[model samples]
Target chain A: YGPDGDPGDPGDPGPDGRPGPDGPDGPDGDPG
Target chain B: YGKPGPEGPEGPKGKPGPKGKPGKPGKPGKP
Candidate 1:
């Protein structure tokens, strides 16, 4: 008789995030 | 009833009506 909103237990996992770079080059027209 | 259709017989007076020739020049498109 005691567990309506318990706060405690559960935390461990971090490290591994970096990858996003590459976008540029588009301009040589002749669209008629 | 015979003279009601007399105005149509005057169409024979259309002999001096001839002059409509000149329309041919539309082919220059450099667009």
Candidate 2:
């Protein structure tokens, strides 16, 4: 659970916050 | 991992707030 955290990566541009945990950026690096 | 939750500029602006469960406060010194 994301606790009080509603899904969506604060800037990726999609819900569930996943940048590609299942796609090209699958390793969806949170590089910042 | 704590599930490596999504990065974010998460919620709240100086909350009033979640006010989570606090520990015990043993008041008054033992006599």
Candidate 3:
């Protein structure tokens, strides 16, 4: 093995922030 | 590796919305 290329620097923070706080709940529609 | 980006804060919760109100009781339907 060529002593691995020192593992890449975690590409980007894409997935990291993806699971952040969720959006507020949508307004409740009229009951049918 | 440069420590992960602050362990990405905890994910948003799912169990939040309150239970919906129950519908009015109606007569039993014919078989």
Query: Which model scores highest in DockQ?
Result: 3
Q: Residue A12 CA error for candidate 3 (Å)? A: 21
Q: What are the TM-scores, per candidate, against the unseen true structure? A: 0.20, 0.16, 0.23
Output the better candidate (1/3) by lDDT. 3
lDDT of 3 at A32: 50
The candidate, 1 or 2, that scores higher on TM-score is: 1
Per-residue error (Å), model 3, residue A20: 24
Model 3 lDDT tens row, A1-32: 23333433433333322333444445455445
* TM-score of the second chain, cand. 1: 0.26
Could you give the candidate ranking by DockQ, starting with the highest? 3, 2, 1
TM-score for candidate 1, residues paired by index: 0.20
Chain A TM-score relative to the true structure, per candidate:
0.18, 0.14, 0.31
Q: Write the per-residue lDDT of candidate 1 for residues B1-31, one digit (tens) a residue.
A: 1222222222222233334444444444443
Given candidate 2, what's the lDDT at residue A12?
A: 38
Total backbone collisions for each predicted model:
0, 4, 0
Candidate 3 or 1, higher TM-score: 3
How many backbone clashes are present in model 2? Answer: 4
Off by over 4 Å in 1: A1-32, B1-12
Residue pairs clashing in model 1 are none
Output the lDDT of residue A7, model 2: 49
At residue A9, candidate 2 shows an lDDT of: 49
